[PDB]
Design an enzyme around this catalytic site. Structure first.
Site, mmCIF file in Angstrom:
data_model
loop_
_atom_site.group_PDB
_atom_site.id
_atom_site.type_symbol
_atom_site.label_atom_id
_atom_site.label_comp_id
_atom_site.label_asym_id
_atom_site.label_seq_id
_atom_site.Cartn_x
_atom_site.Cartn_y
_atom_site.Cartn_z
ATOM 1 N N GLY A 31 5.067 -1.517 3.930
ATOM 2 C CA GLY A 31 4.329 -1.352 2.766
ATOM 3 C C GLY A 31 3.252 -2.405 2.414
ATOM 4 O O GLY A 31 3.159 -3.570 3.609
ATOM 5 N N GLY A 33 -0.637 -4.581 0.519
ATOM 6 C CA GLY A 33 -1.354 -4.678 -1.492
ATOM 7 C C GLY A 33 -1.919 -6.208 -1.528
ATOM 8 O O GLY A 33 -1.850 -6.433 0.110
ATOM 9 N N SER A 34 -2.175 -6.207 -2.501
ATOM 10 C CA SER A 34 -3.190 -7.280 -3.037
ATOM 11 C C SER A 34 -1.834 -8.773 -2.707
ATOM 12 O O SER A 34 -2.731 -9.896 -2.233
ATOM 13 C CB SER A 34 -3.674 -7.447 -3.906
ATOM 14 O OG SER A 34 -4.763 -6.828 -4.297
ATOM 15 N N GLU A 104 16.545 -5.334 -2.357
ATOM 16 C CA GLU A 104 17.537 -3.904 -2.082
ATOM 17 C C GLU A 104 16.109 -2.666 -1.370
ATOM 18 O O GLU A 104 15.277 -2.735 -1.714
ATOM 19 C CB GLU A 104 17.998 -3.296 -2.803
ATOM 20 C CG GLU A 104 17.446 -2.800 -4.592
ATOM 21 C CD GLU A 104 17.841 -2.017 -5.400
ATOM 22 O OE1 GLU A 104 19.283 -0.501 -5.101
ATOM 23 O OE2 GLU A 104 17.537 -1.871 -6.262
ATOM 24 N N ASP A 152 1.124 -1.520 -14.733
ATOM 25 C CA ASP A 152 0.830 -0.662 -13.430
ATOM 26 C C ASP A 152 1.939 0.196 -13.215
ATOM 27 O O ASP A 152 1.991 0.537 -11.654
ATOM 28 C CB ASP A 152 0.494 -1.892 -12.436
ATOM 29 C CG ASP A 152 -0.705 -1.087 -11.145
ATOM 30 O OD1 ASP A 152 -1.158 -0.306 -11.607
ATOM 31 O OD2 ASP A 152 -0.223 -1.561 -9.894
#
Ligand SMILES: COc1ccc(-c2cc(N)nc(N)n2)cc1
Length: 340
Positions: A31, A33-34, A104, A152
């Site tokens: 993953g 992201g910003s 988790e 979001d």
């Protein structure tokens, strides 16, 4: 950068195999992201797989993830089974000048699930399971003590617990806030952005309900309901389906005149390409009378005309232009669509 541990994006340079505080083995980057990165990791101590969100070594993102930690811990306090629709934050720590949130391990997001259907969508029955869970999640967030606007909601921020079950959870409260500002910000991903936010108006929890309506149609059809190339394109595509917003909204809306014209009689129309307003019926998009989306659900269990009619009713109530009258989570859950 940072005794060499950081790239020029202030991200931590992840090494597959690395071991941390003699506890966590970093397996892989799952993953980005910003905010920074997310890694899959084995917790030697608790004998379990975890997702670690590694925040960027920059004070704005550190400060924002501190708000994320506060909100997640607030949610985790609550002695209700509704909080199991929100990803569990186990703990957090500072490591090599990075704040790290230990979650988790979940599974794929709903975007992956749509890619697995080759973007033709999942059954009305699976859509219904996801919808019940998401309405409960939003009923939880709207608890007065909490009053959290996620801000979001989209397929990418909704993850399966595991690849075998229909259980889901909401992730990423990094863009979230508690109600008590009522100011305009350029927020929500464009496809899932509420008309109040497009129109530069102050927002409340109703914006998450807008996003959810858009998500559930896309889960079933395989495609985004409103795929705008920009804000004008986005509003125009909404007006193709839902017609002209009420005048009492547009009269109060700072950016009304970005998309609409007030006519001498005090009525509004689109400004100066697109199907005429309201000509793209949800009735037709869903294939209510015609075997569902592109006729692909022709004679299947729980795909009756009445089933589609109830789904359509629920969605149109979530896609209300007026944030005051837009269906609230409790009532969404009492909708006949969920009487199965
Ligand atoms: C698959 O396990 C995951 C993957 C990601 C996340 C996660 C949590 C969070 N709060 N914010 C973001 N951005 N991602 C949790 C579990």
């Amino acid at each position: 950068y940072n005794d060499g541990y950081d790239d020029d994006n202030y991200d931590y340079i992840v090494k597959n195999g690395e071991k941390w505080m003699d506890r966590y083995e970093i397996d892989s980057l799952i993953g980005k992201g910003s905010f920074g990165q997310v890694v899959k990791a084995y917790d030697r101590v608790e004998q379990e797989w975890v997702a670690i969100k590694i925040i960027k070594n920059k004070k704005a993102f550190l400060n924002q993830a501190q708000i994320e930690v506060r909100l997640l811990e607030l949610m985790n306090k609550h002695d209700t089974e509704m909080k199991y629709y929100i990803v569990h934050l186990k703990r957090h720590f500072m490591f090599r000048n990075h704040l790290c949130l230990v979650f988790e391990m979940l599974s794929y997001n709903l975007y992956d699930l749509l890619r697995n259907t080759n973007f033709r969508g999942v059954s009305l029955n699976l859509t219904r399971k996801f919808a019940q869970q998401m309405c409960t999640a939003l009923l939880f967030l709207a608890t007065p003590e909490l009053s959290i606007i996620h801000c979001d909601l989209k397929p990418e921020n909704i993850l399966l617990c595991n690849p075998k079950r229909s259980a889901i959870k909401i992730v990423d409260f990094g863009s979230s806030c508690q109600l008590g500002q009522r100011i305009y910000q350029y927020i929500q991903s464009r496809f899932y952005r509420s008309p109040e936010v497009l129109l530069g108006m102050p927002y409340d929890l109703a914006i998450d309900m807008w996003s959810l309506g858009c998500i559930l149609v896309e889960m079933h059809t395989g495609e985004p309901l409103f795929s705008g190339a920009n804000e004008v394109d986005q509003m125009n595509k909404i007006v193709e389906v839902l017609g002209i917003p009420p005048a009492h909204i547009l009269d109060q809306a700072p950016k009304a005149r970005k998309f609409f014209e007030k006519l001498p009689d005090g009525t509004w129309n689109l400004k100066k390409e697109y199907k005429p307003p309201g000509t793209r019926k949800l009735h037709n998009i869903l294939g209510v009378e015609t075997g569902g989306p592109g006729g692909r659900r022709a004679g299947e269990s729980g795909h009756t005309v009445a089933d589609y009619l109830k789904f359509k009713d629920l969605i149109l109530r979530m896609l209300d232009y007026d944030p005051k009258t837009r269906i609230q989570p409790y009532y969404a859950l009492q909708h006949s669509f969920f009487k199965k």
